[PDB]
């Protein structure tokens, strides 16, 4: 029996930028979700389509762990039915989402005096993302009537913008690490079970 490697997901030195959000599939293992949701490390632990207390009694085909960094004020956008730059252009959950959203303050890891500019988000997009879609393209965004032809200027914007993360920001502008666990059911044997 293998224990699910949630530790590797939650403890990675660096997290993905939200526009290029990282995904791991978790399979063929036993997961104790009580160890997770009974941790005081998390400032957000919200489950959708399941009661978190039955999770240790369920089996799924696979579990997915998507992870990335956003600012605190944006954590509310990681839920089904939300709107906003993050939910619309970076990471979208479906309305029938079955899974848990887990977030914690990462000011000590991801901010620096001077600003950590390595974490980015998509500011502009011609249409909303589909659920679980990822957009890693870097085309100049044509905000007005004139085609941009690769050149930046007014109404012609590079679509990705950097977070500013500094440790002295208020909590709304501090980095939060987010892990979204999705529970998948396919026409196949279950491979991830509670204890």
């Amino acid at each position, epitope marked *: 029996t293998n224990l699910c490697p949630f530790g590797e997901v939650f403890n990675a030195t660096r997290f993905a930028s939200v526009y290029a959000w990282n995904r791991k599939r978790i399979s063929n293992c036993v997961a104790d979700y009580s160890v997770l949701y009974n941790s005081a490390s998390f400032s957000t632990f919200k489950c959708y389509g399941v009661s978190p207390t039955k999770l240790n009694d369920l089996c799924f085909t696979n579990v997915y762990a998507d992870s990335f960094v956003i600012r605190g004020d944006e954590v509310r956008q990681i839920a089904p039915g939300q709107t906003g730059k993050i939910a619309d252009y970076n990471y979208k959950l479906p309305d029938d989402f079955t899974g848990c959203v887990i977030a914690w303050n990462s000011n000590n890891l991801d901010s620096k005096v001077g600003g950590n500019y390595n974490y980015l988000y998509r500011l502009f997009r011609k249409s909303n993302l*589909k*659920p*679980f879609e990822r957009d890693i393209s*870097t085309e100049i965004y044509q905000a007005g009537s004139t085609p941009c032809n690769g050149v930046e200027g007014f109404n012609c914007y590079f679509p990705l913008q950097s977070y500013g993360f500094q440790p002295t920001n208020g909590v709304g502008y501090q980095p939060y690490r987010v892990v979204v666990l*999705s529970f998948e059911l396919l026409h196949a044997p279950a491979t991830v079970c509670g204890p």
Partner: antibody
Amino acid sequence: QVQLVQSGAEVKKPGASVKVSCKASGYTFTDYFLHWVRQAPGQGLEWMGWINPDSGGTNYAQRFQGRVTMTRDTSISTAYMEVSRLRSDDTAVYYCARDNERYQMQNYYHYYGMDVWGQGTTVTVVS
Amino acid sequence: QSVLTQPPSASGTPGQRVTISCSGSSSNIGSNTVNWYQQLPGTAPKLLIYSNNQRPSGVPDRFSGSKSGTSASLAISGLQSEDEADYYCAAWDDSLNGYVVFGGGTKLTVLG
């Protein structure tokens, strides 16, 4: 290195079936979907379908629904495509290609392209 | 099923910029990302561009991709003779079951 190695050239009579194989190495076989694409002599690429080696689920192009079966054997990291009721214009090169997005959710699949290609298998259908 | 429309041929000289268009519909390019393949005579296609404008490792920077609305374009900025090849665009089409649609392909000749 990541690679897909296909089985050799096949010559079949009309109405027969053919089964072509595609062995994956250099990565974890179940992490990525596999696509099958064919190309008739002097013509363009034509998608045949995808298989998810993690579940065995498939999505066939409607033109081949009922005539093509894709399968896999994860113990030996190999995908198979069987085409039945062969016609002369099934004569073509058959590619398997790796879906380039790791860890798709099958019920929320997103196609971003195919990054690793087999060398191709010719199938010739003649009496 | 649907088709993606490419010109049957294109050409340019070395040092010139050549563009190849790819026209689709709201259910494929209008909804999904565009990827491009290069096929040299007698060999398997090779991924050139994905996610509208991303280059796989090993693809030189003179290849670029764009998308707007229901169409897309491949640019080769500074043709080299080894770029003589067939080029295909492709995209998911959400119609019915969902399926990959390929362009009809474009033969590029390099007049060098």
